[PDB]
Design a protein around this motif. Structure first.
Motif, short mmCIF file in Angstrom:
data_model
loop_
_atom_site.label_atom_id
_atom_site.label_comp_id
_atom_site.label_asym_id
_atom_site.label_seq_id
_atom_site.Cartn_x
_atom_site.Cartn_y
_atom_site.Cartn_z
N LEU A 1 2.63 3.35 7.43
CA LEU A 1 1.65 3.50 6.36
C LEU A 1 2.30 3.83 5.03
O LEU A 1 1.75 3.51 3.98
N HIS A 2 3.47 4.48 5.05
CA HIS A 2 4.21 4.67 3.81
C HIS A 2 4.88 3.38 3.34
O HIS A 2 5.03 3.17 2.14
N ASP A 3 5.27 2.51 4.28
CA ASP A 3 5.91 1.26 3.89
C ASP A 3 4.89 0.25 3.37
O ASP A 3 5.17 -0.48 2.41
N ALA A 4 3.70 0.21 3.98
CA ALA A 4 2.68 -0.76 3.62
C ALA A 4 1.72 -0.25 2.55
O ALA A 4 0.59 -0.74 2.46
N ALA A 5 2.13 0.72 1.74
CA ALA A 5 1.27 1.26 0.70
C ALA A 5 1.26 0.42 -0.57
O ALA A 5 0.26 0.45 -1.30
#
Ligand SMILES: [Mg+2]
Lengths: 434, 162, 96, 128, 40, 513
Positions: free
Chosen positions: F185-189
């Motif tokens: 979820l931090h990468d796909a933000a």
RNA sequence: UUAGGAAUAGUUAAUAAUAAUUUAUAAUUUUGAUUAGAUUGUUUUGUUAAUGCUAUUAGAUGGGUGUGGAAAAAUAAAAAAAAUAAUUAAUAUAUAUCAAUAAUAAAUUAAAUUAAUCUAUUAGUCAGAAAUGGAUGCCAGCCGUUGCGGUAAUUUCUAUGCUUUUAAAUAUUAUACAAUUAUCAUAUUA
């Protein structure tokens, strides 16, 4: 085809431009080489390239299954790309299983067509000279294996005959030389419905001068003489198909005498006004067009000063325009289709119904359809791969038959539209007037 | 390639697998046609020759009597009095099996069964230099009624006669 | 190919005199039908095409037959095979 | 569903072989060389040997020799218990043995336990 | 042909047939009844 | 004899070539006679025929006759998926007997053909029809706050990792399963709409209890099985007192959408305002006018996470539900094992100095060493053709791109990496226009089979799709040197396979004691 | 059985001889053998006035396994094959429905096999006139690879009717008139 090794995949490990087989690796290993763009030719035996030819065509249909109309066009494009990489050398007599003169044993499809003693003694030399006419040893250093298989089948049509069953009564054989598409079992049934139609409608319609368009092997021309039409004339743009068809008419006895074959693009010449060939007016014009998977899909308009359609719809509008100049009054045109234009291309409208409803040049006199009974290849171009029709496409195909007459000839066929069980349009009931 | 086919069957018949495995190993390395796929590993790589053992046996002494005995590497010999009593057990057991006749062989090896030979001249062929001892081709090469029709003579008087 | 030796329907070996050496190694034509066309261009002008033939000598109805062949090729009717077979067919000394 | 007419009669009731299709084509010279090279690969023979025509398994004299010639997995016993395990396998694990062990012989193996490795050798003899 | 019902003794074996010919005593009794009706 | 009509001519004796039985045995994978040296890492395609592929042939497909040590190949089986019904005992009737156990495979295929006769709408089947409610009851479990959905996704990761390779030190499994979803979820933000792929156990909503002791059954009433799968399925311990999971070997390949801040459609495109370089001369018409290529979806832009699904503890059987493209990254151990085995066989069997010719298939007497060098060169050409070389972080390995269809079985060994992409359709590229420019301007007809993608710090979970079913099996044994030296395939043409996979490998002294 | 007719042999008999260390003046053949060619045979077919001529498709199979009573065993729509599977009827098979593969090839030759209303039935006939229906070129222009013209060439074979039928071969001689061309061959003597 002569390969250019500088434009190949690996010109360092394979300086000849192709990857030789040696008959050791699996079929899917060869299929991975062909999918990446590497050419494949046998090293020792024809059996290694024959096993690679059947298995790659079977593995490609498993990766791209025919699930709808758009999947058959992609599969025909993929199979045409891959089967061109499967090569065989031009001097195929240096391979091991071409012929054995002592054991009278050989590998290839020539054992399906010829005898063992006849091939290994005399027919290996006659086939060597047969390829030299179409593919010389100078210009070609390699042959596509589909072209090598078609040359073996065309050499069978050169040596012996080719029966057209159940169109011809078991003794009349044709000899298509090379590049002339013969008819399979699926290609026969649109002409089998036409032969039953011509058996019953000859005499109520008084058909004497028949004109056949795009004869090919001449199967539509010979089917009309069996039903009793005295004067038949065929038009074929292939010149070598014209010389072979008129030679088969001499070979097929004395009941094929008034048959004529000329070279023309779609119709006869009709150029000289002083010689007046317009007095020869036909009362029935037959058209049996070919429907390939590439030609049925890419139908579109082209041309600025002469806007014309391409593909199957453009071939029909050529037939639907110039047929009036060669037809007599109270004459009909007969169109033999196979309903693949609506199956392989269902989004586009009906091309035959586009002529009747919109252009209003022809009136639908009669229409028949019959489901497909057999299996096989459909409209096979000769030097390409074989593709048999799948089961889900075979059960929905139908052999159609369209009988149209002129818009100016309503008053002659007016009593035909007045019978019960017929479908008169709204324009022919206004011209009858009780 | 005809010489390798005969000489392999002679060494198999005369119970020589080391000479037969070395013949298949030699014909694959020299490029003899028909034998480039048959290549055998040398299981006698550490073992000496058979004539060298018989020369050593006439003249380390515990290893001299058991130099002919072949071991897997994960095997060890018995004591010299126990191993010598075991070697005479296998001597009398091998000759007991080889003295029993096979009942439908007419006293022949399986190489001798159905091995009739005539040269290539006996079946519609003539002299060629590369065919030294060429076995005559089978009768399925020339079928009758494909060379001449029924009730018509064919020019093969002594073809099918073996 | 048809003059090469073949067994007939009765099995006996027949041989035509065409594949002998006198008729086998026979040159195609005897008449000077080998001509030069130095330039042959199809130029698309506005509303028309122009086929230019630049050559020293031409045969009877040669240009008018080549124009018909090019017109049939413009509709997409021939391939690499049929043009070469027509060129290898040569001269036909028969009107019909 | 019997193999009476599919294989030779000496292979009647035959189970547990590696592949019984091998022993139907042994007499062919390409397979007869393969059989004699396999006996040299198995060791224990000073002369070239082929197994009999009506035998699929090894003969009883030959399989007894290769069992006796087979080196034990435990080489160089340090403890007198480990010397008793090698005497246990020569006596109670010979080829086609008939004599069974004795509970007094199990007491002899349990009285020589010195190190904790000896208990694993002793309790595995208790399981047999 | 000998009938193999589903409620016979199953042979849990991947090297042969999945159902034996060992019956149930009810199957034995009804087979005896059918045997008598054929015996007449 | 047969009655034959007498003719006064000669008789034709045909020796006509049939379909080779060895060819269909090699295609179906049921040959059991091919001795093939030079073990490679290229994947094997097997078309599943009717009753031609079982555990007996699949064991030889994993371990070939050449003496392999590890099943180091991805095995694609076209149309090999099976569907099992639940079995039950009959209380009524003449006695007690268990029925219902049957396989729906090889007779009820996925994606039935839609042919009919009357920008453009065509009718197709893109999803597997049998397992579609079974995927529906998994997709509805993730349907909706956002934190409850995030901890539902983190609680359903298979083994805590879900296939993702992430460095985790001094951390338990339940915190690692949350840290992986937090990293995703931090990468796909940054992207407005992106996706990632995970391995997921079956949820509680997909398994319902049945009273007769305790029977757990699937919600759709069908079980995705592979009848030619060898060995034992993976046993997963239930945590919540550790018992076995009832369907722990059946897992799912979930595609999860992120938010940050049966009708394909075809269109024919045109353009406004040297062709065959492999051919020596020039042709009046090209021999192949059009090309067909596979259309894949767009990958969003890229430190960067690995995003490779690796199962290091189980053997993977992928049953795709949609048209997928799997990019397999080969581990170092498989290529190292194949290299050392091929070089060992080359230095053992080919002791000749080979003469040093120009290329491998040159003119000369074809000795055994020349045949071996030619086969090794053809194997290297197959490896170079069907693969590509990518970059790593520093690293470079073979990448094999595999087109996987619904109904197939993709056997993935342990340690093999793969990335998953979705196939969106099919394009047509003409060879005339592609010679002058890129094939994006040379597009003629484009069929879009997937009309999917809609357009309505951290990232939010939008939706969940089931793209494939992951059947996890126990890791198959790796043979040692002595086990592979004594492994003979002819001892396993009838039996010994369940003993091969239950016990570790095979016996070193198997059948020659 | 062979239009141009000669030699043959794991050999014949005897035998206290299974499994022949012997004996013999041995055996087949000009009353046609062996070998080579053709080759399943068969008052079943066809024809005729015909004891004539002419056709045939029941079959078998010393090295694949000594198993089995018997090798006939690598493939056959039934010959129902050890619990009444089914025994009302007709299709009895396609449909054992997909799949590499080609009509090359193998057979065959009408006279309903369930019912749900309703079409069946060569030609405006051609006494012979028609056929962009076959085959088919020739030529010197004062004369160079310019490729103009006679010239839209003229003749020769034809279907069809007309299963009242017309052309090609064979049957039915079971007899072949004489004298000649040529071969299988007894000299007529009180
Ligand atoms: Mg005597």
């Amino acid at each position: 085809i002569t390969l250019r090794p500088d434009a190949t995949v690996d010109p360092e490990r394979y300086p000849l431009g192709y990857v030789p087989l040696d008959g050791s690796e699996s079929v899917d290993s060869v299929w991975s080489l062909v999918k990446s763009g590497a050419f494949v030719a046998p090293l020792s035996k024809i059996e290694t390239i024959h096993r690679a030819h059947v298995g790659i065509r079977y593995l490609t249909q498993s990766e791209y299954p025919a699930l709808s109309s758009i999947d058959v066009v992609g599969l025909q494009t993929r199979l045409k790309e891959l089967c061109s990489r499967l090569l065989i050398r031009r001097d195929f007599w240096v391979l091991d299983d071409y012929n054995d003169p002592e054991l009278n044993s050989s590998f290839g499809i020539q054992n399906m067509y010829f005898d063992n003693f006849k091939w290994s003694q005399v027919l290996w030399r006659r086939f060597q000279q047969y390829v030299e006419e179409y593919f010389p040893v100078a210009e070609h250093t390699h042959l596509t294996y589909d072209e090598y298989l078609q040359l073996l089948r065309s050499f069978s049509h050169f040596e012996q005959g080719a029966k057209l069953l159940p169109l011809l009564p078991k003794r009349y054989r044709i000899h298509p030389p090379f590049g002339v598409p013969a008819l399979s079992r699926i290609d026969m049934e649109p002409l089998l419905l036409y032969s039953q139609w011509l058996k019953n409608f000859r005499g109520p319609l008084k058909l004497d001068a028949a004109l056949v368009i795009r004869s090919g092997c001449g199967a539509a021309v010979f089917a009309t003489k069996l039903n009793g039409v005295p004067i038949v004339r065929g038009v074929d743009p292939n010149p070598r198909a014209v010389m072979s068809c008129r030679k088969d008419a001499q070979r097929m006895g004395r009941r094929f005498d008034s048959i004529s074959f000329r070279v023309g693009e779609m119709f006869p010449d009709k150029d000289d006004g002083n010689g007046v060939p317009n007095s020869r007016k036909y009362d029935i014009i037959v058209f049996y067009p070919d429907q390939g998977c590439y030609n049925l899909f890419f139908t579109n308009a082209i041309g600025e000063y002469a806007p014309v359609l391409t593909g199957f719809a453009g071939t029909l509008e050529h037939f639907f325009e110039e047929a009036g100049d060669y037809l007599s009054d109270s004459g009909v045109i007969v169109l033999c289709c196979t309903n693949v234009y609506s199956i392989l291309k269902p989004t586009e409208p009906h091309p035959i119904e586009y002529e009747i409803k919109v252009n209003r040049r022809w009136v639908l006199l009669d229409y028949y359809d019959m489901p497909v009974r057999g299996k096989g290849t459909l409209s096979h171009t000769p030097t390409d791969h074989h593709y048999r029709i799948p089961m889900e496409m075979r059960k929905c195909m139908r052999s159609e038959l369209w009988v149209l007459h002129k818009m100016t000839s309503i008053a002659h066929f007016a009593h035909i539209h007045n019978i019960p069980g017929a479908q008169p349009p709204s324009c022919v009931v206004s011209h009858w007037r009780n | 390639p005809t010489m390798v086919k005969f000489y392999h069957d002679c060494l198999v018949r005369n119970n020589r697998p080391r000479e037969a495995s070395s013949l298949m190993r030699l014909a694959a390395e020299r490029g003899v046609h028909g034998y480039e796929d048959k290549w055998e590993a040398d299981v006698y790589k550490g073992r000496p020759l058979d004539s060298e053992v018989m020369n050593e046996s006439e003249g380390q002494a515990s290893s001299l009597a058991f130099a002919s005995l072949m071991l897997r590497g994960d095997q060890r010999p018995l004591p010299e009095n126990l191993q010598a009593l075991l070697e005479e057990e296998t001597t009398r057991n091998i000759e007991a099996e080889r003295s029993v006749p096979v009942p439908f062989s007419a006293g022949l090896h399986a190489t001798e069964i159905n091995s009739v030979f005539r040269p290539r001249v006996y079946r519609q062929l003539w002299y060629k230099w590369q065919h030294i001892a060429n076995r005559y081709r089978p009768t399925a090469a020339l079928k009758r009624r494909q060379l001449a029709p029924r009730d018509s003579p064919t020019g093969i008087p002594g073809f099918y006669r073996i | 190919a048809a003059a090469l030796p073949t067994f007939n329907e009765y099995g006996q070996r027949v041989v035509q005199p065409g594949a002998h050496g006198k008729e086998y190694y026979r040159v195609a034509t005897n008449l000077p039908t080998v001509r030069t066309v130095d330039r042959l261009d199809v130029v698309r002008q506005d509303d028309e095409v122009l086929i230019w033939f630049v050559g020293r000598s031409f045969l009877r109805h040669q240009i008018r037959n080549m124009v018909s062949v090019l017109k049939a090729a413009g509709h997409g009717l021939w391939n690499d095979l049929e043009l070469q077979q027509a060129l290898q067919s040569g001269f036909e000394p028969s009107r019909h | 569903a019997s193999l009476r007419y599919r294989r030779p009669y000496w292979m009647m009731f035959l189970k547990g072989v590696d592949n019984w299709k091998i022993y139907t084509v042994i007499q062919q010279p390409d397979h007869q060389r393969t059989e004699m090279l396999y006996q040299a690969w198995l060791g224990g023979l000073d002369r070239p040997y082929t197994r009999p025509k009506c035998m699929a398994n090894q003969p009883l004299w030959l399989s007894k020799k290769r069992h006796m010639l087979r080196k034990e997995r435990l080489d160089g016993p340090e403890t007198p218990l480990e010397k008793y395990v090698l005497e246990w396998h020569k006596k109670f694990h010979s080829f086609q043995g008939t004599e069974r062990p004795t509970p007094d012989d199990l007491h002899t193996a349990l009285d020589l336990v010195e190190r904790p490795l000896d208990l694993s050798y002793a309790l595995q003899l208790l399981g047999q | 042909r000998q009938i193999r019902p589903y409620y016979n003794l199953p042979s849990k074996s991947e090297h042969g047939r999945k159902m034996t010919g060992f019956l149930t005593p009810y199957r034995h009794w009804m087979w005896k009844q059918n045997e008598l009706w054929r015996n007449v | 004899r047969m009655p034959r009509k007498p003719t006064p001519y000669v008789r034709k004796f045909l020796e006509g070539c049939p379909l080779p039985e060895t060819l269909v045995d090699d295609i179906a994978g049921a040959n059991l006679k091919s001795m093939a040296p030079f073990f490679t890492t290229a994947p094997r395609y097997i078309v599943a025929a009717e009753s031609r592929l079982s555990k007996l042939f699949f064991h030889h497909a994993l371990y070939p006759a050449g003496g392999a040590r590890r099943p180091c190949r991805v095995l694609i089986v076209r149309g090999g998926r099976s569907v099992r019904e639940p079995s039950f005992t009959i209380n009524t009737g003449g006695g007690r007997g268990e029925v219902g156990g049957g396989s729906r495979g090889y007779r009820d295929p996925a994606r039935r053909a839609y042919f009919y006769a009357r920008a453009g709408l065509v009718k197709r089947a893109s999803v597997d029809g049998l397992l579609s409610p079974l995927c529906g009851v998994i997709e509805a479990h993730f349907a909706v706050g956002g934190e409850k959905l995030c901890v539902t996704l983190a609680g359903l990761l298979s083994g805590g990792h879900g296939g993702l390779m992430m460095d985790d030190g001094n951390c338990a499994s339940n915190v690692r399963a949350a840290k992986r979803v937090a990293r995703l979820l931090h990468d796909a933000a940054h992207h407005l709409s992106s996706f990632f792929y995970v391995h997921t156990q079956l949820p509680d909503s997909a398994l319902f209890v049945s009273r007769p002791v305790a029977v757990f059954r699937l919600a759709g009433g069908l079980e995705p099985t592979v009848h030619f799968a060898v060995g034992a399925p993976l046993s997963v311990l239930q945590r919540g007192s550790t018992t076995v999971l009832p369907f722990g070997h059946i897992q799912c390949l979930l595609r999860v959408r992120t938010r940050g801040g049966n009708t394909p459609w075809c269109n024919t495109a045109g353009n406004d305002d040297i062709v065959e370089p492999w051919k020596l001369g020039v042709s009046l018409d090209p021999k192949v006018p059009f090309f067909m290529r596979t259309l894949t979806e767009k990958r969003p832009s890229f430190v960067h996470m690995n995003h490779l699904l690796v199962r290091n503890d189980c053997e993977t059987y992928l049953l795709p539900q949609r048209e997928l493209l799997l990019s397999f990254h080969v581990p170092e151990e498989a290529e190292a094992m194949c290299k050392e085995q091929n070089e060992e066989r080359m230095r053992r069997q080919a002791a000749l100095g080979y003469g040093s010719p120009s290329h491998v298939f040159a003119e000369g007497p074809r000795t055994f060493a020349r045949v071996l060098h030619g086969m090794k060169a053809n194997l290297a050409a197959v490896e170079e053709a069907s693969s590509t070389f990518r970059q790593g972080a520093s690293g470079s390995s073979r990448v094999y791109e595999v087109r996987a269809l619904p109904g197939d079985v993709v056997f993935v060994p342990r340690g093999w990496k793969y990335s998953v992409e979705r196939i969106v359709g099919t394009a047509i590229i003409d060879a005339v226009a592609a010679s002058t420019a890129s094939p994006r301007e040379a597009l003629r007809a484009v069929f879009r089979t997937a009309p999917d993608p809609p357009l309505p710090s951290n990232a939010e979970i939008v939706g969940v799709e089931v793209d494939a079913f992951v059947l996890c099996y126990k890791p198959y044994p790796v043979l040692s040197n002595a086990q592979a030296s004594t492994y003979v395939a002819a001892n396993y043409v009838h039996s010994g396979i369940d003993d091969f996979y239950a016990k570790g490998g095979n016996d070193v002294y198997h059948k020659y004691t």
